[PDB]
């Protein structure tokens, strides 16, 4: 089921929000255009969006773009089910009741793109929006998981392998600023609707994609695969070239 | 009409866009998004502690602007363009292309959160908090493109717009002056971030900005050939959450 991702109506994203080290166990967050959605191809001309299927689905490959170095950040997706609008604090037991299921997300960034936006103190939306730079899987029902309903902050485990090799691997029990948290400080800023989709933050381990390469992603609840999706990158055609 | 509202998927938005200086008309962009949860009506276009609680059938969301605390607030009038159709890497657009692209255009605040933003670039980070809050997108009801359908070949010195609080007029520029016109506006943006029918783009304001604070009175419009076609007002009031800035 991808039905969900006709009802997002924006998508919210955290940044550096895991540990890498023992020692670490502030925030900030950027949106991503719904039109950068693109979902495996086992879900007009020279077009690389065209808008959701009538099912939610849009199958394609990954275009990256020319002169653009593109990183793969594998992650953990909440779909908000309830309105949130300047919640003055949210308990474990209540991320629950806030969203419908969560999804495995990949929030592709245009590196060198990104550099030269944070140098110059520019926006990061086209870095973080390029067409098919959130490839996402289909929704997983909380239902699957309410035997956690008091906390889900430690049951997923999320991981991203590129031609065959594992390079990101991260429990969400590693995150600095919890669900809850995440949900409720939000809120205070940008009201929450339901439909919203949340990216909580990338595990350590970001590597780099291009064309040619195959992508394979997974999403684990109490270490038991849940979500397991693949993705194809290629060349994005039209007249566009990031050049410094 | 605000039933267009409903239907926008995404707002963008060009900056530094507007001339401020005759010299630079004889003659590089860049973008930011803004969440559609920041749209805001006038209070006559028509739960609890709630500064967003989603869109009426109707499209409107009549309310104050929310100033939220020890946020600096900076007004920014420009022109929204309503998109009607599937734009993806276009090569070439010419200004005739302009009105078949769109089904209207609106009147649009693009609010930011001065120094919220001051201190984004300062530590080179994103943009979306000082320009997200919700209500920081002021916007008018739709101005089909029938009212304007008699200059289809080229509308990009048709329009002006204009900025006044608490009595005094603050921006006043034609859409002569933007340095990026509405052709190329839409061509470029296509060749990075497609866009569908019913997206909004923003397409920048001219010099004069200034602040709003809590009690302040907004008065904007949009003229068509020096005509008045869209007048709203808006007032500020503290945004009722638990949310402070402090540098
Ligand atoms: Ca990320
Ligand atoms: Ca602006």
């Not at 245009?110 to 490839?135: C, H, Y």
């Not at 909580?200 to 390469?213: I, M, N, Q, S």
């Not at 397991?228 to 990031?242: A, S």
């Given at each position: 089921s991808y039905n969900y991702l006709k009802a997002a109506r924006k998508i919210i994203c955290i940044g550096r929000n895991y540990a890498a080290h023992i020692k670490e166990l502030q925030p900030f967050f950027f949106l991503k255009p719904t039109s950068s959605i693109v979902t495996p191809l086992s879900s007009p001309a020279n077009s690389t969006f065209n808008g959701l299927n009538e099912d939610g689905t849009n199958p394609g490959p990954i275009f990256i773009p020319r002169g653009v170095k593109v990183h793969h950040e594998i992650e953990l997706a909440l779909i908000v089910s309830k309105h949130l609008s300047n919640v003055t604090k949210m308990k474990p037991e209540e991320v629950y009741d806030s969203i419908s299921g969560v999804?495995?997300?990949?929030?592709?960034?245009?590196?060198?793109?990104?550099?030269?936006?944070?140098?110059?103190?520019?926006?990061?939306?086209?870095?973080?929006?390029?067409?098919?730079?959130?490839?996402?899987?289909?929704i997983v029902s909380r239902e699957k998981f309410s035997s956690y309903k008091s906390n889900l902050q430690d049951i997923f485990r999320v991981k991203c392998s590129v031609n065959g090799?594992?390079?990101?691997?991260?429990?969400?029990?590693?995150?600095?600023?919890?669900?809850?948290?995440?949900?409720?400080?939000?809120?205070?800023?940008?009201?929450?609707?339901?439909?919203?989709?949340?990216?909580?933050?990338?595990?350590?381990?970001?590597?780099?994609?291009?064309?040619?390469?195959?992508?394979?992603?997974?999403?684990?609840?109490?270490?038991?695969?849940?979500?397991?999706?693949?993705?194809?990158?290629?060349?994005?055609?039209?007249?566009?070239?990031?050049?410094?």
């Open positions: 999804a495995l997300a990949l929030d592709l960034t245009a590196r060198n793109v990104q550099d030269e936006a944070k140098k110059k103190g520019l926006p990061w939306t086209i870095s973080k929006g390029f067409d098919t730079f959130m490839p996402i899987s289909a090799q594992l390079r990101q691997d991260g429990g969400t029990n590693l995150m600095l600023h919890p669900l809850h948290k995440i949900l409720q400080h939000i809120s205070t800023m940008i009201s929450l609707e339901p439909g919203d989709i949340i990216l909580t933050g990338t595990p350590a381990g970001v590597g780099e994609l291009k064309p040619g390469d195959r992508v394979h992603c997974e999403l684990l609840q109490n270490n038991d695969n849940i979500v397991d999706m693949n993705f194809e990158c290629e060349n994005r055609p039209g007249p566009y070239e990031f050049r410094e």
